Amino acid sequence: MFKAVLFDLDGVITDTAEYHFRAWKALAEEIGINGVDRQFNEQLKGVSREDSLQKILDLADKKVSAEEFKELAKRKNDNYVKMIQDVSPADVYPGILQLLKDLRSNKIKIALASASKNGPFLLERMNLTGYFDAIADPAEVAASKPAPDIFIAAAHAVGVAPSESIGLEDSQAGIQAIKDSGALPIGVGRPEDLGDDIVIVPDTSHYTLEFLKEVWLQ
Ligand SMILES: [Mg+2]
């Protein structure tokens, strides 16, 4: 049986999509760029901060120096961090808390493998820190998803090989990263984004210990 489960944060444990959206909107409003509405924000989901900022500047063909770019990116982040002060246990996705409890009572290691620079803060706000055996520090890994580095680091941090682990993710790049780490992916979402070759559940309420055991056996 698997010895560890490696969790991404966003799209598995929770999301902060409304807060990122409000941050970018607020920034666009500040600088007088029209177009940054909910529909447009779909093009920013899971995209890097710098790429998201450039997409917004492009709406107005707007040209900016390195330092100005840096400052607008900082401004959006400051926005975002202020807004996530309201994250709470109610932000935990369906099924995850019970999964965590069951994993822990069966002595299965639990690790975070998230690019989020606010991972530990977010886990504290959701009251989930006591379940985590480790949090892979995204600042200490050479390469980001779909590179496997973060999943390797996470499994190693809890004393296991990735081949002993299940990885849970909602993105194609995450699922690839899990695959190449040597852990077993189980995706949440749809095959059109994630691929046909891995097990997928429609939502996180399907992530149960019983189900992860059935996948591992199979
Ligand atoms: Mg994710």
Side-chain angles (χ1 to χ4, degrees):
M1 190 53 45
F2 62 99
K3 302 304 183 307
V5 182
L6 322 168
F7 291 82
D8 189 33
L9 184 69
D10 196 271
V12 182
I13 294 172
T14 198
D15 70 77
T16 48
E18 189 65 27
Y19 296 128
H20 283 295
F21 165 48
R22 292 162 60 205
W24 283 124
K25 185 172 175 172
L27 188 62
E29 283 172 345
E30 271 210 337
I31 68 180
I33 296 172
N34 298 352
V36 187
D37 60 11
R38 199 167 284 283
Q39 181 56 25
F40 176 81
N41 181 255
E42 296 302 304
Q43 297 167 233
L44 312 183
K45 279 179 163 153
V47 179
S48 79
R49 183 173 61 163
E50 289 72 33
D51 293 349
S52 291
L53 177 52
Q54 195 54 59
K55 288 203 191 307
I56 289 165
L57 295 171
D58 289 342
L59 291 167
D61 202 38
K62 167 170 180 82
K63 310 297 168 207
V64 303
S65 71
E67 181 54 63
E68 176 157 8
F69 191 92
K70 177 180 181 156
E71 183 60 26
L72 294 173
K74 188 189 169 278
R75 270 197 251 153
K76 179 262 162 172
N77 192 57
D78 288 338
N79 285 343
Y80 171 78
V81 166
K82 266 176 216 167
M83 290 176 258
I84 64 175
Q85 299 302 301
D86 292 343
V87 174
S88 92
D91 291 302
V92 180
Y93 273 5
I96 297 294
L97 177 59
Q98 190 66 55
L99 177 57
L100 292 168
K101 273 165 140 168
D102 294 344
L103 291 174
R104 187 171 73 171
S105 56
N106 286 262
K107 321 201 172 312
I108 295 164
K109 306 302 179 152
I110 293 162
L112 199 77
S114 178
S116 176
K117 291 207 160 56
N118 304 295
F121 168 79
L122 290 166
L123 294 181
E124 266 182 11
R125 291 298 311 181
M126 299 184 285
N127 195 50
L128 299 181
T129 304
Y131 297 105
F132 278 76
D133 292 295
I135 299 170
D137 185 352
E140 299 300 325
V141 306
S144 60
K145 294 170 200 184
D149 304 18
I150 191 75
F151 287 101
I152 294 165
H156 283 184
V158 299
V160 311
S163 53
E164 304 184 89
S165 310
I166 283 169
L168 301 187
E169 259 284 24
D170 75 324
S171 75
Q172 192 281 330
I175 291 295
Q176 192 59 231
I178 295 160
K179 287 172 148 214
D180 292 335
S181 70
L184 179 61
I186 310 170
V188 51
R190 49 157 210 171
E192 290 88 333
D193 307 318
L194 309 189
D196 284 356
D197 56 331
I198 58 131
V199 176
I200 290 169
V201 299
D203 61 69
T204 58
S205 79
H206 294 254
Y207 284 148
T208 64
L209 173 64
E210 176 185 301
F211 185 69
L212 305 205
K213 296 204 177 161
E214 297 180 27
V215 175
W216 189 264
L217 288 197
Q218 286 196 345

